[PDB]
Coordinates of C-alpha atoms and ligand atoms in Angstrom, one line a residue:
Chain A
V5 CA 127.7 69.9 86.8
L6 CA 128.8 66.7 85.1
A7 CA 126.7 63.6 84.6
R8 CA 128.4 60.3 85.2
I9 CA 127.2 57.2 83.4
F10 CA 127.4 53.7 85.0
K11 CA 127.4 50.2 83.6
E12 CA 125.0 47.6 85.2
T13 CA 128.1 45.7 86.3
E14 CA 129.4 48.6 88.3
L15 CA 126.3 48.6 90.6
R16 CA 124.8 46.1 93.1
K17 CA 121.8 46.2 95.3
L18 CA 122.2 45.1 98.9
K19 CA 119.0 45.9 100.9
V20 CA 115.6 47.5 100.2
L21 CA 115.3 50.8 102.0
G22 CA 111.8 51.7 100.9
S23 CA 109.5 52.4 98.0
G24 CA 107.4 55.4 97.2
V25 CA 105.3 56.8 94.4
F26 CA 107.8 56.6 91.5
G27 CA 110.7 54.2 92.2
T28 CA 112.2 51.7 94.7
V29 CA 115.2 52.8 96.8
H30 CA 117.9 50.2 97.6
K31 CA 120.9 50.7 99.7
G32 CA 123.6 49.3 97.5
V33 CA 127.2 49.6 96.5
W34 CA 129.5 50.9 93.7
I35 CA 132.2 48.5 92.3
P36 CA 133.9 50.5 89.4
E37 CA 135.7 49.0 86.4
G38 CA 138.4 46.6 87.3
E39 CA 138.4 47.4 91.0
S40 CA 137.4 45.3 94.0
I41 CA 136.3 48.2 96.2
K42 CA 132.8 48.4 97.5
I43 CA 131.7 52.0 98.0
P44 CA 128.4 52.4 99.8
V45 CA 125.8 54.2 97.7
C46 CA 122.0 54.6 97.2
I47 CA 120.5 53.1 94.1
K48 CA 116.9 54.1 93.2
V49 CA 115.3 52.0 90.5
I50 CA 112.6 53.4 88.3
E51 CA 110.8 51.0 86.0
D52 CA 110.5 52.0 82.3
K53 CA 106.8 52.7 81.7
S54 CA 107.6 54.5 78.4
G55 CA 106.8 51.6 76.1
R56 CA 109.3 53.1 73.6
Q57 CA 112.1 51.4 75.6
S58 CA 113.5 54.8 76.5
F59 CA 115.7 54.1 79.5
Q60 CA 118.1 52.0 77.5
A61 CA 119.9 55.3 76.5
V62 CA 120.8 58.5 78.3
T63 CA 118.2 61.1 77.6
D64 CA 118.4 64.9 77.9
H65 CA 116.4 65.0 81.1
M66 CA 118.8 62.5 82.7
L67 CA 121.6 64.8 81.7
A68 CA 119.7 67.7 83.2
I69 CA 119.3 65.9 86.5
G70 CA 122.9 64.7 86.5
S71 CA 124.3 68.2 85.6
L72 CA 123.2 69.7 89.0
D73 CA 125.2 70.2 92.2
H74 CA 124.5 72.5 95.1
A75 CA 125.3 72.6 98.9
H76 CA 121.6 72.0 99.8
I77 CA 120.5 69.5 97.2
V78 CA 121.3 65.7 96.9
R79 CA 123.9 65.5 94.1
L80 CA 123.3 62.6 91.6
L81 CA 126.6 60.7 91.5
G82 CA 125.6 58.6 88.5
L83 CA 122.8 57.0 86.4
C84 CA 122.5 53.5 84.9
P85 CA 120.3 53.0 81.8
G86 CA 118.7 49.7 80.7
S87 CA 115.3 48.1 81.1
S88 CA 115.3 49.8 84.5
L89 CA 116.7 53.2 85.3
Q90 CA 119.1 53.3 88.3
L91 CA 119.8 56.7 90.0
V92 CA 122.9 56.6 92.3
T93 CA 123.3 59.1 95.1
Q94 CA 125.2 59.3 98.4
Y95 CA 123.9 57.4 101.4
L96 CA 122.9 59.8 104.1
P97 CA 122.6 57.8 107.3
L98 CA 120.9 60.6 109.3
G99 CA 117.7 59.9 107.3
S100 CA 114.9 62.2 106.3
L101 CA 114.0 65.5 107.8
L102 CA 110.5 64.3 108.5
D103 CA 111.6 61.4 110.7
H104 CA 114.1 63.6 112.4
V105 CA 111.7 66.4 113.4
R106 CA 109.2 63.6 114.4
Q107 CA 112.0 62.1 116.6
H108 CA 113.4 65.2 118.4
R109 CA 110.4 67.4 118.0
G110 CA 110.6 70.5 120.3
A111 CA 114.1 69.6 121.4
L112 CA 115.4 70.9 118.2
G113 CA 116.3 74.6 118.2
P114 CA 113.9 77.1 116.6
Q115 CA 117.1 78.6 115.0
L116 CA 117.6 75.2 113.3
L117 CA 114.0 75.1 112.1
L118 CA 114.3 78.6 110.5
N119 CA 117.7 77.9 109.1
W120 CA 116.4 74.6 107.6
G121 CA 113.6 76.6 106.0
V122 CA 116.3 78.9 104.5
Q123 CA 118.3 75.9 103.3
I124 CA 115.4 74.2 101.6
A125 CA 114.5 77.5 99.9
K126 CA 118.2 77.7 98.9
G127 CA 118.2 74.4 97.2
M128 CA 114.9 75.0 95.5
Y129 CA 116.2 78.4 94.3
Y130 CA 119.2 76.7 92.8
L131 CA 117.0 74.1 91.1
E132 CA 114.7 76.9 89.7
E133 CA 117.6 79.0 88.3
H134 CA 118.6 76.0 86.2
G135 CA 115.0 75.4 85.0
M136 CA 114.7 72.2 87.0
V137 CA 111.1 71.5 88.3
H138 CA 111.0 69.2 91.3
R139 CA 107.3 68.0 91.1
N140 CA 107.7 66.1 94.4
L141 CA 108.9 68.4 97.2
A142 CA 108.1 67.3 100.8
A143 CA 109.6 66.8 104.2
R144 CA 110.1 63.1 103.4
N145 CA 112.3 64.1 100.4
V146 CA 114.6 66.2 102.5
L147 CA 117.6 64.4 103.9
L148 CA 120.1 65.4 106.5
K149 CA 123.7 65.6 105.2
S150 CA 124.8 67.1 108.5
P151 CA 123.0 67.6 111.8
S152 CA 122.8 71.3 110.7
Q153 CA 122.6 70.7 106.9
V154 CA 119.6 69.5 104.9
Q155 CA 119.5 68.6 101.2
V156 CA 116.6 68.3 98.7
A157 CA 116.2 65.0 97.0
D158 CA 114.1 63.2 94.3
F159 CA 114.0 66.2 92.0
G160 CA 113.2 65.8 88.3
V161 CA 112.2 62.2 89.0
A162 CA 108.5 62.7 88.2
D163 CA 109.0 63.6 84.6
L164 CA 110.9 60.4 83.9
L165 CA 107.5 58.6 83.9
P166 CA 104.4 59.1 81.7
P167 CA 101.7 61.5 83.0
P180 CA 101.7 63.3 96.7
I181 CA 98.2 64.9 96.3
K182 CA 98.6 66.7 99.7
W183 CA 101.8 68.5 98.6
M184 CA 100.6 69.4 95.1
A185 CA 99.2 72.8 94.1
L186 CA 95.6 73.1 92.7
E187 CA 96.6 73.5 89.0
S188 CA 98.8 70.3 89.4
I189 CA 95.8 68.4 90.7
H190 CA 93.3 69.7 88.2
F191 CA 95.3 70.0 85.0
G192 CA 98.6 68.2 85.7
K193 CA 100.3 71.6 85.4
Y194 CA 103.7 71.6 87.2
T195 CA 105.6 74.9 87.7
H196 CA 108.3 76.3 90.0
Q197 CA 105.3 78.0 91.7
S198 CA 103.8 74.6 92.4
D199 CA 107.1 73.8 94.0
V200 CA 106.4 77.0 96.0
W201 CA 103.1 75.5 97.2
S202 CA 104.9 72.2 98.0
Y203 CA 107.6 74.2 99.8
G204 CA 104.9 75.8 102.0
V205 CA 103.4 72.4 102.9
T206 CA 106.9 71.1 103.6
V207 CA 107.6 73.9 106.1
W208 CA 104.2 73.2 107.6
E209 CA 105.4 69.6 108.1
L210 CA 108.7 70.9 109.6
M211 CA 107.3 73.3 112.2
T212 CA 104.4 70.9 113.2
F213 CA 107.2 68.3 113.9
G214 CA 106.0 65.9 111.3
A215 CA 102.3 66.3 111.3
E216 CA 100.2 64.7 108.5
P217 CA 98.7 67.3 106.2
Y218 CA 94.9 67.0 106.2
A219 CA 94.9 64.0 108.6
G220 CA 91.2 63.6 109.2
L221 CA 90.4 64.2 105.6
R222 CA 90.6 61.8 102.7
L223 CA 92.2 62.4 99.4
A224 CA 89.0 62.0 97.4
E225 CA 88.6 65.8 97.5
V226 CA 91.2 67.5 99.4
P227 CA 91.2 69.7 96.2
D228 CA 87.5 70.7 96.8
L229 CA 88.4 72.1 100.2
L230 CA 91.4 73.9 98.9
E231 CA 89.1 75.6 96.4
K232 CA 86.6 76.3 99.2
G233 CA 89.1 78.5 100.9
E234 CA 90.6 76.1 103.6
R235 CA 94.3 75.7 104.1
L236 CA 96.6 73.9 106.6
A237 CA 95.9 75.3 110.1
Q238 CA 98.3 77.6 111.9
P239 CA 101.1 75.6 113.7
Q240 CA 101.1 75.8 117.5
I241 CA 104.7 77.1 117.6
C242 CA 104.2 79.4 114.6
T243 CA 103.8 83.2 115.0
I244 CA 101.4 84.9 112.6
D245 CA 104.5 86.2 110.8
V246 CA 105.7 82.7 109.9
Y247 CA 102.3 81.4 109.1
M248 CA 101.6 84.2 106.7
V249 CA 104.4 83.0 104.5
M250 CA 102.9 79.5 104.2
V251 CA 99.6 81.1 103.5
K252 CA 101.0 83.1 100.6
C253 CA 102.7 79.9 99.4
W254 CA 99.2 78.3 99.2
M255 CA 97.6 81.0 97.0
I256 CA 95.5 79.8 94.1
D257 CA 96.7 82.5 91.7
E258 CA 100.1 81.3 90.6
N259 CA 102.1 84.6 90.5
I260 CA 100.7 85.7 93.8
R261 CA 102.8 83.0 95.4
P262 CA 106.3 84.0 96.7
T263 CA 109.5 83.2 94.8
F264 CA 112.1 81.0 96.3
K265 CA 114.6 83.8 96.8
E266 CA 112.0 86.0 98.6
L267 CA 111.3 82.9 100.7
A268 CA 115.0 82.3 101.5
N269 CA 115.5 86.0 102.3
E270 CA 112.5 86.2 104.7
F271 CA 113.4 83.0 106.4
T272 CA 116.8 84.5 106.7
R273 CA 115.4 87.7 108.3
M274 CA 113.5 85.5 110.7
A275 CA 116.7 83.4 111.3
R276 CA 118.2 86.6 112.5
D277 CA 115.8 86.6 115.5
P278 CA 114.5 83.0 116.1
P279 CA 112.6 83.4 119.4
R280 CA 110.6 86.3 117.9
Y281 CA 109.1 84.1 115.3
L282 CA 109.0 80.6 116.9
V283 CA 107.7 79.9 120.4
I284 CA 108.8 76.6 121.8
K285 CA 109.0 75.8 125.6
Chain B
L11 CA 127.1 76.6 109.8
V12 CA 124.2 78.8 110.8
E13 CA 123.6 82.5 110.2
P14 CA 123.9 85.3 112.9
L15 CA 122.1 85.4 116.3
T16 CA 121.6 89.2 116.0
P17 CA 118.8 89.4 118.7
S18 CA 116.3 92.2 119.1
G19 CA 114.5 90.6 121.9
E20 CA 110.9 91.9 121.9
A21 CA 107.7 89.8 122.0
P22 CA 106.5 87.4 119.3
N23 CA 103.1 88.1 117.6
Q24 CA 101.2 84.9 118.3
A25 CA 97.9 86.2 117.0
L26 CA 95.8 83.3 115.6
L27 CA 94.7 83.6 111.9
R28 CA 91.8 81.1 111.7
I29 CA 91.1 80.1 108.1
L30 CA 87.5 79.5 107.0
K31 CA 86.0 78.0 103.9
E32 CA 83.5 79.8 101.7
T33 CA 80.7 77.4 102.5
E34 CA 80.9 78.2 106.3
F35 CA 79.5 81.7 105.7
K36 CA 76.6 83.0 103.6
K37 CA 76.2 86.3 101.8
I38 CA 72.9 88.2 102.4
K39 CA 73.3 91.7 101.0
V40 CA 75.8 94.4 100.1
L41 CA 76.9 97.0 102.7
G42 CA 79.6 98.6 100.6
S43 CA 80.9 98.7 97.0
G44 CA 83.9 100.1 95.1
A45 CA 87.2 99.5 93.3
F46 CA 88.5 97.9 96.5
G47 CA 86.0 95.1 96.2
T48 CA 82.7 94.7 98.0
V49 CA 81.7 94.5 101.7
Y50 CA 78.8 92.1 102.2
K51 CA 76.5 91.3 105.1
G52 CA 76.1 87.6 106.0
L53 CA 75.8 84.7 108.4
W54 CA 78.8 82.7 109.6
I55 CA 78.1 79.1 110.6
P56 CA 81.2 77.6 112.2
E57 CA 82.3 73.9 111.9
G58 CA 80.6 71.8 114.5
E59 CA 80.1 74.9 116.6
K60 CA 76.6 76.4 116.0
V61 CA 76.0 79.9 117.1
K62 CA 75.1 82.1 114.1
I63 CA 77.3 85.0 113.8
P64 CA 76.2 88.1 111.8
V65 CA 79.4 89.1 110.0
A66 CA 80.7 91.5 107.5
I67 CA 82.5 89.9 104.6
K68 CA 85.0 92.2 102.9
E69 CA 85.9 90.5 99.6
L70 CA 88.6 92.1 97.4
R71 CA 89.4 92.0 93.7
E72 CA 92.2 89.5 93.0
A73 CA 95.7 90.7 93.3
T74 CA 97.5 92.6 90.5
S75 CA 101.0 92.2 91.8
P76 CA 103.0 89.7 93.9
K77 CA 102.5 92.0 97.0
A78 CA 99.4 93.9 95.6
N79 CA 98.1 90.9 97.4
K80 CA 100.0 91.2 100.6
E81 CA 98.9 94.8 101.5
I82 CA 95.6 92.9 101.8
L83 CA 97.5 90.3 103.8
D84 CA 99.0 93.1 106.0
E85 CA 95.6 94.4 106.6
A86 CA 94.6 90.9 107.7
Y87 CA 97.7 90.7 109.8
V88 CA 96.9 93.9 111.7
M89 CA 93.2 93.0 112.1
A90 CA 94.3 89.6 113.5
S91 CA 96.9 91.2 115.8
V92 CA 94.7 93.8 117.5
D93 CA 92.5 93.1 120.5
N94 CA 90.3 95.9 121.9
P95 CA 86.7 96.6 122.9
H96 CA 87.0 99.7 120.6
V97 CA 88.7 98.1 117.7
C98 CA 87.1 95.6 115.3
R99 CA 88.9 92.3 115.3
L100 CA 89.3 89.8 112.5
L101 CA 87.4 86.5 113.0
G102 CA 89.1 84.9 110.0
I103 CA 89.8 84.9 106.3
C104 CA 88.8 82.8 103.3
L105 CA 91.6 82.2 100.9
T106 CA 90.5 81.6 97.3
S107 CA 90.7 83.4 94.0
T108 CA 89.6 86.5 95.9
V109 CA 90.7 87.0 99.5
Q110 CA 87.8 87.5 101.9
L111 CA 88.2 89.2 105.3
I112 CA 85.6 88.3 107.9
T113 CA 84.7 90.6 110.8
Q114 CA 81.8 90.7 113.3
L115 CA 78.8 92.6 111.9
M116 CA 77.9 96.0 113.3
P117 CA 74.1 96.5 113.0
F118 CA 74.2 100.3 112.6
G119 CA 77.2 100.2 110.4
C120 CA 79.1 103.3 109.4
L121 CA 79.2 106.1 112.0
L122 CA 79.4 108.8 109.4
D123 CA 76.1 107.6 108.0
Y124 CA 74.7 107.4 111.6
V125 CA 75.5 110.9 112.6
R126 CA 73.7 112.0 109.4
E127 CA 70.6 109.9 109.4
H128 CA 69.9 110.5 113.1
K129 CA 70.9 114.2 113.0
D130 CA 68.3 115.3 115.5
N131 CA 68.1 112.4 118.0
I132 CA 71.8 112.5 119.0
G133 CA 72.5 114.1 122.3
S134 CA 75.5 115.5 124.1
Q135 CA 76.4 112.4 126.1
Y136 CA 76.5 110.2 123.0
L137 CA 78.9 112.3 120.9
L138 CA 81.2 112.8 123.9
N139 CA 81.2 109.1 124.6
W140 CA 82.0 108.3 121.0
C141 CA 84.9 110.7 121.1
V142 CA 86.1 108.9 124.3
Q143 CA 85.8 105.4 122.8
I144 CA 87.7 106.5 119.7
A145 CA 90.4 108.0 121.8
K146 CA 90.7 104.8 123.8
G147 CA 90.8 102.6 120.7
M148 CA 93.5 104.8 119.0
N149 CA 95.4 104.8 122.3
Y150 CA 95.4 101.0 122.2
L151 CA 96.7 101.2 118.6
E152 CA 99.4 103.5 119.9
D153 CA 100.4 101.0 122.5
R154 CA 100.7 98.3 119.8
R155 CA 103.0 100.7 117.9
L156 CA 100.8 100.6 114.8
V157 CA 99.7 103.8 113.1
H158 CA 96.2 104.0 111.7
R159 CA 97.0 106.0 108.6
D160 CA 93.4 106.4 107.7
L161 CA 91.3 107.6 110.7
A162 CA 88.0 109.1 109.8
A163 CA 84.2 108.9 110.5
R164 CA 84.1 106.6 107.4
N165 CA 86.2 104.0 109.2
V166 CA 84.3 104.0 112.5
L167 CA 81.6 101.3 113.0
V168 CA 78.6 101.2 115.4
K169 CA 77.8 98.1 117.3
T170 CA 75.2 99.9 119.5
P171 CA 74.6 103.6 119.9
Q172 CA 76.6 103.3 123.1
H173 CA 79.5 101.4 121.4
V174 CA 81.7 102.1 118.4
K175 CA 84.9 100.6 116.9
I176 CA 87.7 101.3 114.5
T177 CA 88.5 99.5 111.2
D178 CA 89.9 99.7 107.7
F179 CA 93.7 99.2 108.5
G180 CA 94.3 99.1 104.7
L181 CA 96.9 101.8 105.0
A182 CA 98.0 100.9 108.6
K183 CA 101.7 100.4 109.1
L184 CA 103.5 98.8 112.1
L185 CA 106.3 100.8 113.7
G186 CA 109.3 98.7 115.0
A187 CA 110.9 99.6 118.3
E188 CA 113.5 101.0 115.9
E189 CA 111.3 103.5 114.1
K190 CA 109.6 106.6 115.4
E191 CA 108.3 107.8 112.1
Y192 CA 106.8 106.0 109.1
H193 CA 107.7 107.5 105.7
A194 CA 105.7 106.5 102.6
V199 CA 95.7 108.9 100.7
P200 CA 92.9 111.1 102.0
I201 CA 94.4 114.6 102.0
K202 CA 91.6 116.3 104.0
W203 CA 92.2 114.0 107.0
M204 CA 96.0 113.9 107.0
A205 CA 98.3 116.1 109.0
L206 CA 100.4 118.8 107.3
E207 CA 103.7 116.8 107.5
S208 CA 101.9 113.8 105.9
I209 CA 101.0 116.1 103.0
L210 CA 104.4 117.9 102.7
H211 CA 106.9 115.2 103.7
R212 CA 104.7 112.0 103.7
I213 CA 105.7 111.4 107.4
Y214 CA 103.2 109.4 109.4
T215 CA 103.2 109.2 113.2
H216 CA 100.9 108.7 116.2
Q217 CA 100.5 112.5 116.4
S218 CA 99.3 112.4 112.7
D219 CA 96.4 110.2 113.8
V220 CA 95.7 112.9 116.3
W221 CA 95.2 115.4 113.5
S222 CA 93.0 112.8 111.9
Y223 CA 91.3 112.4 115.2
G224 CA 90.5 116.1 115.3
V225 CA 89.0 115.9 111.8
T226 CA 86.9 112.9 112.9
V227 CA 85.5 114.6 116.0
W228 CA 84.8 117.6 113.7
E229 CA 82.8 115.3 111.4
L230 CA 80.8 114.0 114.4
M231 CA 80.1 117.5 115.9
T232 CA 79.0 118.7 112.5
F233 CA 76.8 115.7 112.2
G234 CA 78.4 114.2 109.1
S235 CA 79.5 117.4 107.2
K236 CA 82.2 117.1 104.6
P237 CA 85.7 118.6 105.5
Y238 CA 86.8 121.5 103.4
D239 CA 84.1 121.0 100.8
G240 CA 84.3 123.2 97.7
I241 CA 88.0 123.4 98.3
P242 CA 89.9 121.0 96.0
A243 CA 92.4 118.6 97.7
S244 CA 94.7 120.5 95.3
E245 CA 97.0 122.4 97.7
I246 CA 94.8 122.5 100.8
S247 CA 98.4 122.6 101.9
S248 CA 98.6 126.4 101.4
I249 CA 95.5 127.2 103.4
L250 CA 97.1 125.4 106.3
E251 CA 100.2 127.4 105.5
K252 CA 98.1 130.5 106.1
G253 CA 97.0 129.0 109.4
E254 CA 93.4 128.5 108.4
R255 CA 91.7 125.4 109.9
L256 CA 88.3 123.8 110.1
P257 CA 85.5 126.1 111.3
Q258 CA 83.9 125.7 114.8
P259 CA 80.8 123.5 114.7
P260 CA 77.6 125.2 115.9
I261 CA 77.1 122.8 118.9
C262 CA 80.7 123.1 120.1
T263 CA 81.9 125.2 123.0
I264 CA 85.2 127.2 122.9
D265 CA 86.8 124.4 125.0
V266 CA 85.9 121.6 122.6
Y267 CA 86.9 123.5 119.6
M268 CA 90.1 124.3 121.5
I269 CA 90.9 120.6 121.5
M270 CA 90.0 120.4 117.8
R271 CA 92.4 123.3 117.2
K272 CA 94.8 121.4 119.4
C273 CA 94.9 118.4 117.2
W274 CA 95.6 120.5 114.1
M275 CA 98.7 122.3 115.3
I276 CA 101.7 122.3 113.0
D277 CA 104.1 121.2 115.7
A278 CA 103.4 117.5 116.1
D279 CA 104.7 117.5 119.7
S280 CA 102.5 120.4 120.6
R281 CA 99.5 118.3 119.7
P282 CA 97.7 116.3 122.4
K283 CA 98.2 112.6 123.1
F284 CA 95.4 110.0 123.0
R285 CA 95.7 109.4 126.7
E286 CA 95.2 113.1 127.3
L287 CA 92.2 113.1 124.9
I288 CA 90.6 110.2 126.8
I289 CA 91.0 112.1 130.1
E290 CA 89.6 115.4 128.7
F291 CA 86.6 114.0 126.8
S292 CA 85.8 111.6 129.7
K293 CA 85.8 114.7 131.9
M294 CA 83.4 116.5 129.5
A295 CA 81.2 113.4 129.3
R296 CA 80.2 113.8 133.0
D297 CA 78.4 117.1 132.1
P298 CA 77.7 117.0 128.4
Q299 CA 75.1 119.8 128.3
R300 CA 77.8 122.2 129.5
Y301 CA 80.2 121.4 126.7
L302 CA 77.7 120.9 123.9
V303 CA 74.7 123.1 123.2
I304 CA 71.9 120.9 121.7
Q305 CA 68.3 122.0 121.9
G306 CA 66.9 118.5 121.6
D307 CA 68.4 117.6 125.1
Ligands
LIG1 N1 120.4 59.2 99.9 C1 119.6 58.5 100.7 N2 120.2 58.1 101.9 C2 119.4 57.4 102.7 N3 118.1 57.0 102.6 C3 117.6 57.5 101.5 C4 118.3 58.2 100.5 N4 117.4 58.5 99.5 C5 116.3 58.0 99.8 N5 116.3 57.3 101.0 C6 115.2 56.6 101.7 O1 114.5 55.9 100.7 C7 113.2 55.6 101.4 C8 112.1 55.4 100.3 O2 112.6 56.0 99.1 P1 111.5 56.8 98.1 O3 110.3 55.9 98.1 O4 112.1 57.1 96.8 O5 111.2 58.1 98.9 P2 109.9 58.4 99.6 O6 110.2 58.5 101.1 O7 108.9 57.2 99.4 N6 109.2 59.9 99.1 P3 108.6 59.8 97.5 O8 108.9 58.4 96.9 O9 109.2 60.9 96.6 O10 107.0 60.0 97.6 C9 113.0 56.7 102.4 O11 112.7 56.1 103.7 C10 114.2 57.5 102.4 O12 114.7 57.8 103.7
LIG2 N1 81.8 94.8 110.5 C1 81.0 95.6 109.8 N2 79.7 95.9 110.1 C2 79.0 96.8 109.4 N3 79.5 97.4 108.3 C3 80.7 97.3 107.9 C4 81.6 96.3 108.6 N4 82.8 96.3 107.9 C5 82.7 97.2 106.9 N5 81.4 97.8 106.9 C6 81.0 98.8 105.9 O1 82.1 99.0 105.0 C7 82.6 100.3 105.2 C8 84.0 100.3 105.8 O2 84.8 99.4 105.1 P1 86.4 99.5 105.3 O3 86.9 98.5 106.2 O4 86.6 101.0 105.6 O5 87.0 99.2 103.8 P2 87.4 100.3 102.7 O6 87.6 101.6 103.4 O7 88.7 99.7 102.2 O8 86.3 100.3 101.7 C9 81.7 101.1 106.1 O9 81.0 102.1 105.4 C10 80.7 100.0 106.6 O10 79.3 100.5 106.4
LIG3 MG1 112.4 59.7 98.4
LIG4 MG1 87.5 103.3 104.5

C-alpha cells in the first residue's frame, strides 16, 4: 500500500542472480540510514532507456507498483531512482515455480498444482482490481514464498521501458496492445507450464511466426496429466476474441472447484 | 494453507481434445446453413500422417457473450467425451475467430432427408435396425449420464444405409452422480414435463425417441404439422398423441404410445427398446407392412 523510497547509499549489490528481457537481478543487501545492519534483499536494475532522464525521479507508475501488497504477489519493498532504476524485493530462496515443478515434477501433489493455479489467479485478480497490468506473466515469474505458497513477480515492469513472445496474446504481438485479458492468455500459458512440469511452449517451433500458427487455429497441446475439464480452461484463456477469455475471478473460482476434488481433474501416477 | 479435500470420488474425464489448424483441413461445399453458423464438407489432411479424411466442419458465428462461447465449448466437450459406434465422435476443433468443430463425414448425411428421398426403397429390416442402433446409442449416452436434450431425425446421421449415428449435442447437458433431473427448444419433440416444468431426464429422451421413430416410420413426415407449437401442451393434456403410421403394426405403435406416456417411469428404457426392436428385427415383415418388400 505504501511506496518506500531508497537512497543509492542504502543499497549494495553482492552477486548477479540472472538477467531477463527487461532488467538485471542482483542478490544484494539493504543498509539503511546510519545503521550497520545488512538485510538480505533482491535488487533488480532497469537501465533508463527513456532519453528524457526519467528514472532520476519517482514517477506515478513507480508509485503504482510500490502501492501494492497481496498474499500471492511479490511485495515491492522499495525503489531507488537515478541513472538506473533499482527495484528492491524480498529474497525468496525457494526459487521460481518453473524450476520447482521441473525439479519435483510428478512427485508434487495434484492438490498443490490446482491450489497453485488458484493462488496465481488470486494474485492476478488483486493486480487487476487495482488497474495494474502485468505484461509479463509466466512460470519463471512465479516465486515460492512457502512450499505451499506462490507469489507473482515482475508486474508493471514492462511499461517502465519504451515500447516473452510465447506468453503474449495475439493482440500484444500484432499491435502491442496489453490488457488484463492478455494477462489471462499469459495465465493460461503459465498453467500449461505448471501442469506439464516445466515444458517449453512451442518447443520445436521458432519464434519467427508462432503468431501465424496461433492465427491458424493451433494452441498448446493437452497436457498428459490434464483432464479435458482442466484443458478447456487453458483453451478458453487462449481465445482470440478478447472478452471471450475468462476473467481472473472466474479462473480462481473454477480452479477452486477443481481444488475441491484434485484426483478427478489431474491424473498422476 | 490449502483449501478442503471434500472428495466425490468418481472417474476423471481424460478425453483428448486434439487441436487442429485451419490449414490442415479444406472446405469443399456446404451441407448445412443457418443462424447457428454453417456445416461444411471437406478433406482433413493430418500433420505428417497422410490418410485423407472426409470430414464435416461445423463452423459457428463468433461468440456474443463470455459463455455464449462455451455452450459451443460444452458441445465440443461432450462430442470429445463420448465413444460409441452409434454416436458421432469429435475428431478435433480449430480455435480461431470462429470455433470449428470437426467430425467424420457421413456420405448420406441427414437421416430425415434419407427417409424422404428414398421413400420407396426402404424396407422393413432397415427401419427396425435404425431404431435398434438409435436405442443403443442413446443407451450409451444414458450410461455416460448425459442427456441428449435434442433427439430427432434431424440429428441422426447416416454412414451407410446399415449404420447410423447421433449428433448435435448443442443442448446436451451432463448429469452429476448428484443429479437425477436437469432443470433449464423443439416443443414437438420434447416430453410433457419438459414443456410444463422444463425438466429434462433420460426418460424425456425416450419421448423424443418415440417421436424420432415416428418420423422414420412415416418416412420423414412433420410432427403435428398445422398445429402451432403454441400450446400443443393442451392436446397432450387431452391425451391425444401422434397418429399411427400406415406401415406400423399395433405392437410397434404400442411402443410409440409407450414412449409418450405422461408418467416418466411408466415409459420404457433404452435397454428395453433395444431388446424389443432387436426382437422385431428378426422378422421385420411381420411388424411392418411394406409392399415393396
Ligand atoms: N525475489 C527473488 N528471490 C530470488 N530470486 C529471484 C527473485 N526475483 C527474481 N529472482 C531470480 O532472478 C533471476 C533472473 O531475473 P529476471 O531476469 O528479472 O527474471 P526472469 O527469470 O529472466 N523472467 P523475465 O525477466 O521477466 O523474462 C531468475 O532466475 C529468478 O529466479
Ligand atoms: N458428420 C456429418 N456428415 C454429414 N452431414 C453432417 C455431419 N454433421 C452435420 N451434418 C449436417 O448438418 C446437420 C446436423 O448438424 P447439427 O450437428 O445437428 O447442428 P445444428 O442442429 O446445430 O444445426 C445435418 O442435417 C447434416 O446434414
Ligand atoms: Mg523475473
Ligand atoms: Mg440439429
